[PDB]
Amino acid sequence: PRPSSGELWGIHLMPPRILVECLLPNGMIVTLECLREATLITIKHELFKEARKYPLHQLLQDESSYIFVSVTQEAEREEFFDETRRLCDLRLFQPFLKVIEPVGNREEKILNREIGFAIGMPVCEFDMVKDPEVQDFRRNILNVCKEAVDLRDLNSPHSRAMYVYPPNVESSPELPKHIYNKLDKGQIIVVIWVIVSPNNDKQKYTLKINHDCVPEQVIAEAIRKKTRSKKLSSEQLKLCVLEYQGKYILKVCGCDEYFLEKYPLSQYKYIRSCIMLGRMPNLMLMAKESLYSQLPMDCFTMPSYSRRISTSTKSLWVINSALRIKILCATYVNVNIRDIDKIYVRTGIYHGGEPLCDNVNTQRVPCSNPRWNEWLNYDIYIPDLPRAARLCLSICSVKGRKGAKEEHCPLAWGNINLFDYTDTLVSGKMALNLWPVPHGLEDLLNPIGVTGSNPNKETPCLELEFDWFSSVVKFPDMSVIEEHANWSVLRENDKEQLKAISTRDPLSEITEQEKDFLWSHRHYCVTIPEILPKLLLSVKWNSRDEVAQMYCLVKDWPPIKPEQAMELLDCNYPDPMVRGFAVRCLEKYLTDDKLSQYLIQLVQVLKYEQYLDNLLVRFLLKKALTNQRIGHFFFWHLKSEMHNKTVSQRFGLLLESYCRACGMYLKHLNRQVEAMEKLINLTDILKQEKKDETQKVQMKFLVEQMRRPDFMDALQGFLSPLNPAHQLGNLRLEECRIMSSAKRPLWLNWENPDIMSELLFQNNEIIFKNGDDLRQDMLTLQIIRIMENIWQNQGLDLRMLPYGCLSIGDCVGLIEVVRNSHTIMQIQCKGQFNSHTLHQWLKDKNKGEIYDAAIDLFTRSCAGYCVATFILGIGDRHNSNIMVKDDGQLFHIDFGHFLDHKKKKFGYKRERVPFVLTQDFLIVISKGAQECTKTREFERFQEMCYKAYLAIRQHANLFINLFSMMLGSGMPELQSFDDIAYIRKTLALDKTEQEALEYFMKQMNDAHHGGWTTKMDWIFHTIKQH
Amino acid sequence: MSLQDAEWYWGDISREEVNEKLRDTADGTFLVRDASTKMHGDYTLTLRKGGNNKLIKIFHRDGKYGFSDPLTFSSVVELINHYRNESLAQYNPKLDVKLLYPVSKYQQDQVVKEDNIEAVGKKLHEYNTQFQEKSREYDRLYEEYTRTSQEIQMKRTAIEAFNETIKIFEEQCQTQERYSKEYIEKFKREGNEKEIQRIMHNYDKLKSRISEIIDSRRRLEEDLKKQAAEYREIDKRMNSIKPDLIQLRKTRDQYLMWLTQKGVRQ
């Protein structure tokens, strides 16, 4: 069970010397012994020296007339134009090299290799593919690439700098009052640093300015304090300020983060963090030119595939027939003939998750002979088919053994668009290679699943035939549809109910009464534009009459909040107008801040798109190519899934266009990818060949490898995939180690090459982990961050710690290390532990005046995690998965389960309190009081929890939407809307807000065995006490 | 008449639970439950129509219950039986799917045989013990399935790579054949024998190399066939276990419900 992924096929690491077969242009073969780290310049030179000793030498040209070609592990024949590359880095399949004369388009060949390296797949594979939709995509998407690249060079250099180093800022300038009150008379002390010539001295100027100062104003203020010792006319002065105000730019000390834009200073996330923490902002001033010289020149070439030659019509609505589809035969199934009775094919016609008529089975036939030749009739009229209609099918097994009870299991599934991307109604025979059933999915179909034939061709193959109308049939154009709507043709009680329906959450039950009510009042519905998702679900999508009408409404519909618009991109809203509308909202109202925040989900709903080419993908790609911070994560989220064959054609096509237009960042991404690939190889050796060996032996092997020159080259001097603003310099080899945990994670440390790194970010410490699926943690951490943000904006300072977590591949990832923090178990194990050990530890770490602050920080942190883990239903906490910083911040690690996971395997219907505050925590919060729940401190902590809970509940739409967009994501714990039903329970969405709080209090009491009281009367919830 | 004793009145079960019971059922299948609002006296009717579960609110005010504006029915059981004989056309002009097949709770209490709380508790233990064991095995199988799927993908790529490699060594033969043909002819005429042998020696070296690579591919082709067979066998095993596992959970899940049922309640 051990095939190897490494420097060669079947070998992880080339031995220090290796024999390499060289094929000369004259036909001769020469075996050369090479150093595994030797470059191609060296190897070629040695080869041609040696080739003098072999027959037909005279027919060989100058060694500079040739390059090497060979077969790589991806089975591509690859020409090596860059001869500085080391042999061990070539990814050869076998150790041989062929000498050729370089031909063809050299720059394009080189670019394509760089692209293929980034995305994990040779781009020649794309040139192969026959599907019209694919080639159309690769061509048309180039429009988006050119649009962005032009919009980049427009304003140069500034617009190019804005692309590379975007403003990292909050979505609004407005300051919550807990933030504002931290300001001294609405003003902030900032320290501005300059590196002064010749000797690069660091000089410190301290300024007190208005929080809303534009960075240009901050620079003028520094100019004022600088030239103030010198006295001069206030006219020459502010002429001196004016003229030189824009000769400089500001940067954060320690990481590459810039303020290039006239946003208020407190709006930049770094400054806003400094304020809330009472930390000194430290900025570095530098000349605008020394930055704009750093900027690479990005140039975009049209690829050769944009230069190549390529290859009776009736309306859908004139076709008078019922829907009819033929199941012919399946090639094979894997079934145990003795354990199942018969097999058959389930089908359904779906718009989104909803059937447009009831499902239809073929007849049951023996396992051994999967043949039907059955025309299945559906109850719908072909003209009544909506544009997004899909065919959803499965081959199922049926076992009839126990009484009249049967067991139906899906063997394989597939989905088909009833219209293709040219709006052609599908017809004729069709062959569909099917897909494995997703782990945990018990339903006989999988309508959420992607459309299209499984690219693996040894799979069950199901032959179909659709009907033929003796013409090519197209979906009616918009002019036609628009017309048909015009061909169709209390109030205070109604208005209130309408609003009241619109205030509910997405997954709220909508009755048939309410759908008719909604549909009837649909024209007045425009007065409350955010009711749209609910009105859309009231529509009957199997009637062309109602859809045509709904289309005319959408055309003129007022935009809605992105947080709302995003629901329209989930798997429940397949219609191309509807999604278009949703995307135009994001275009108008979605800040880059929110786009970064929600990027995980927006990428995921791309899996739900019926076609490669759509408004959503164009918008995202465009954003990714005009903002490099968005571009970075855009790339890593797509690349991390490229192993998954359901999405890999789509994502690879998207990754190709992105890598063509992204510019010089491609060189940086490739350095990151190369660094991760050495970490994957290294940890694979540890987990495979070295799996039975001691830590000491393994630590000797890790050290000896990391000193290797090819390893140093690759792991030093690149940007961190967790935060590309963090530069990873030289390794600190002495702090690198294999952690004791089961999957053998690596603890890594890098110098921060930043000249100012002492002020902030002196260490970059990262855990590289191979073998666990990090997608669930990553989501959870993201949800925690979105929660923290919600609370801040309400003036609730609950300090969460959503540490960096990034999935880069199949079960491989990076975790950002939190400094100066230990687990509760680690704490108890130093300084014999009673319940008071923790509070004693926290005391020893904060002595004197700073003691109170540490308690305050531990209390707030505590509150936040108590509330969040309740709501999300995180896996149960213990002393190993809870951590505490020396200054008292508490946070959770290792989430790895959430929602309804426990109910599935234990069948208990309950809401857990995952984080139960043991006496140890109550002691800390109470500052060591004897009776901990009776202190005013603990009342304070309760009110925090209460506030935090209702804030999230008020935002329930957002969270529910975010989870809904993950349904097709492959996360076993979130497979359908039932998994999301959990947070509807913990947030008590079907109750009143006051009822919900009562419920939350009750959960806390049941879990903590009393001690959660109320400052309110039972009846009105009004302040009684104090 | 007794609504509590009604066959299709299921009380406080969640929407999800009703979904499970209505899963893939024929049109006309219905049950009534408490509203999700839990407001004491509102109930929600759930009707199966056209592959979809409808939700129909049952309005409770004064003395009478109903769908539409004119509360025409004095009790819940009145309404359901008066929609059980007829179509649904008088709630709405459209529809008219009636109410046909109910969901009974009594065929479900069939499956727990035992009366006392001790026998039920003992069987719950047994099922739940079997359940965690079978789950663990199905998960082990699914990892093996996954691992194997990947390894097969690796090997397929590696056979392709062998193909490309072999072509290239075969082209080298052909290239050698073209050049060396004219040289050995002329060389013979110039009487140099051991230079000819050097060319033939390199040609032997090339051809035996080709034989190695082809046989190494041959072996990998064998390994793939074997694994492809194991992968299908792991797929077979999973397809037997899966349906039995679902039914096992459903049994356990209602023994737990039964155990709750006669047992002290709030």
Ligand SMILES: Cc1nc(NC(=O)N2CCC[C@H]2C(N)=O)sc1-c1ccnc(C(C)(C)C(F)(F)F)c1
């Ligand atoms: C965010 C974070 N920060 C840390 N910091 C320290 O461990 N420190 C900090 C200094 C000493 C040392 C310690 N506590 O002894 S660990 C950590 C983390 C988060 C999530 N999972 C993990 C592991 C180890 C389970 C994983 F996944 F990598 F295997 C670690």
Ligand code: NA
């Ligand atoms: Na430094």
